[model samples]
Target: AQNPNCNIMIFHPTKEEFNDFDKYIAYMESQGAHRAGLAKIIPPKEWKARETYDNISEILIATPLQQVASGRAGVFTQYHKKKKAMTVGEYRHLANSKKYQTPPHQNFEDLERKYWKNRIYNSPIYGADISGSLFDENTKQWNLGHLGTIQDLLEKECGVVIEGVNTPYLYFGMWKTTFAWHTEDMDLYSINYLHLGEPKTWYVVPPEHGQRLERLARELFPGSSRGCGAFLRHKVALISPTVLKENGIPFNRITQEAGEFMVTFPYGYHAGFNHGFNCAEAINFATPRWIDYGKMASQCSCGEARVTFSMDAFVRILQPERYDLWKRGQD
Candidate 1:
């Protein structure tokens, strides 16, 4: 229980559930934890995804943005290993490389660089994805290095169990901006919480509510086939350094501090950004038709559109066939 070698940046240890919280803290401090975040207890059941948290789900209305002119590149992370070496700089350009440009937002790297270098491997966020095999030369993929433990605690507190499954695309990263939304692909919920050393800032405009965003981004930076289409849902804002700004709403000026939220992605319109540079979000994605939404419109990279993951059939993609090994990308 004492992980003296685990370096953690943002984590929520169960001072109650694990019993080894004290020992773990010592272990973390020994490894390198300057700040300690206390766990806020809550039931593991009765948890609702942010969207449904509102009872009526009346489009809770907290819209955000869309970026233009990502350097117009293909995918940053292909599902092939041969093309995984694309550096952070390269992805940054890809984000801004798109065919159009109008408003100014972050590219993939601009959004995640701070987390990878400044947060993940900054020597604090332990639990790096570890290498499955040394097949490649001196390559060591971190097992999300230390955030694993933090994620565990969050699961207990949040009452959701999220597992990680790596795919070829995950071997790298993608999306010019917005990484991915907070819906559980397999069985995870977003309201699941993990306290970070800092607070998080987000602009949630779930899938169904991204119209104005799509409209604006298109009008401002139209011309591309992807234009006007809402592609901004694929992002997770941990702690936005600045409050987000949309149309005229100064999201960045919201005066919010740094803290992990028992936040779940609303089925409406939403995206998150960390208030701090390094944010380790404990995401547990799962899919159980009966429990999720049931209306979707497929057309994104994930095959089953997340917005439509609840589509009657999309929710039950396994009626006629089981989830394909290759298609799932992760088990």
Candidate 2:
């Protein structure tokens, strides 16, 4: 998995921005991610997918689907969406549901109380710390509940930002995760600094976006297959300057070019793979910030849902300033 996942179509920036590796490293040092930990970036091909479910087969085997899902009240879920209500009927219905997935009441102990227990709420991670959830509930109409800024909460709680970047929602949730093939926030923009390796990423866009490309956006390649630059939604754009090939043959290559400098703006669509397989590093800067929460908040608007997280247009107001260079197309 690491091989294919890390081996991406290299898309680098121009020499004017970064002349060589030493210059690139200098820019990385300028960014204050040392606290985020040193992230490892390798060729995208290095992150090929690995079937890791095997490792926990024993623990999972002993754990029933219902227990694994609702045992702790949304602490976690498997193969499907989590449930909100804790009624026995809801549990029974979910248990009987072929498509209902795990029991609705399924949960883990990683919630507001447990996660932040005994810790200083006002600490750096107070508003931050939004990470993958066993059961996530976000939507357009939904505003942050008791927590003012899920972003602030996550930031304070996790010490991170609600990613100013963009991507798909309800990220890889077990069996249904395949539908979520896209780059995640924060990670996308930081790809450039990762010279050691490339992060393998998947991408997608909202249907409305595709509709716009069909109706509003310009089409560079209309009724043509010679080039992949046509205005379509969710197509993979290279984050590095490299070549793209299909079936080991050079076919579609990006004009983005190799080793070019580009700013990554938030919100189009993208996700990355760990450059290395076993160790599982690169999750620097502890805590999921409110910004990350808002992204997930915006993403949780669709699909089967049990509750609402983002209650307002705060995500729009909360979005961060783009890296400038990445905003070229948007501007």
Candidate 3:
């Protein structure tokens, strides 16, 4: 029989529970979840739906940068890759420079229409980065309980900022822009909040099936095994719940709504598509239990166009005494 259990759990916190956000964060961590859904946690007033577009449109016009994306995520093994993409720093520099500007005729409404008829999937990612923003600073305390800033803990102990992986980002998806199947970096946990707009549908595989899915994915997308960015060119075979069950695997699906948070656990394979124009924010984190998995994931790089915190570096920071002390307190 198909598993009777729902893979995704929904959490609705009472006002009292919301008051003590730390308790809820602890509860989620205790679950050791591959995925969890929590709603009505209350994002900042500015993050509400009506304000999202105006705010983001203003940001885009002020610090505009051009990026592209495919309407869906895939590994079309038959395609060719000859284009050289810009580095993150280069992209960031361009994004911030006024040199990149939107057309005068292309109002936010025009861009909205184009988002529906997109061509080259581009970097539509625009958000308040962690370095400085109204909420970024407070997130250190308010994000995922008191231990939300695991990266910060490492930096505080290690005495140097570990770049790349330890960061939070924003996303804006319209029409069909899709995020293909994958797990968080270094098997790290992730918290995604939909600030505003249309909801996103998600497909998630439990941690137990992570390896199996990886094997199946590798066998099916052979081009992926050959190198990185394979999905950008190759055809990514869509695996539905029906397909997984036919293969004796169990999985879950979730359609995240506005003002909701999608918490992803380590090693859960997830994929989803945007329903329409939407604004979202996400960040990566680690708990005391994530050390080994993070280390292992760090060693096994899969040619991803992304970077992660140095698990080894975190280990060094956690070494000897502080690590044990922190674990004892958090656990």
- Best TM-score among the predictions, by candidate number: 3
Off by over 4 Å in 1: 1-189, 192-194, 206-208, 221-230, 233-259, 284-294, 301-331
How many clashes (backbone N, Cα, C below 3 Å) per candidate?
79, 97, 18
What is the C-alpha RMSD, rounded to one decimal, of candidate 1? 16.5
lDDT (Cα, tens digit) per residue for candidate 2, span 71-142: 122111123223332322332233234542321222222221222231111111000112321111331111
Question: What value does the lDDT take at residue 162 in candidate 3?
Answer: 58
Clashes of 1: 79
Models sorted by lDDT, best on top: 3, 1, 2
Residue 72 error, candidate 2, Å:
34
Model 2 CA lDDT for position 226: 29
Candidate 2: worst 10 consecutive residues by lDDT? Answer: 119-128
By TM-score, how accurate is candidate 2?
Answer: 0.24
Runs in model 2 lying further than 4 Å from the true structure = 1-179, 183-265, 271-331
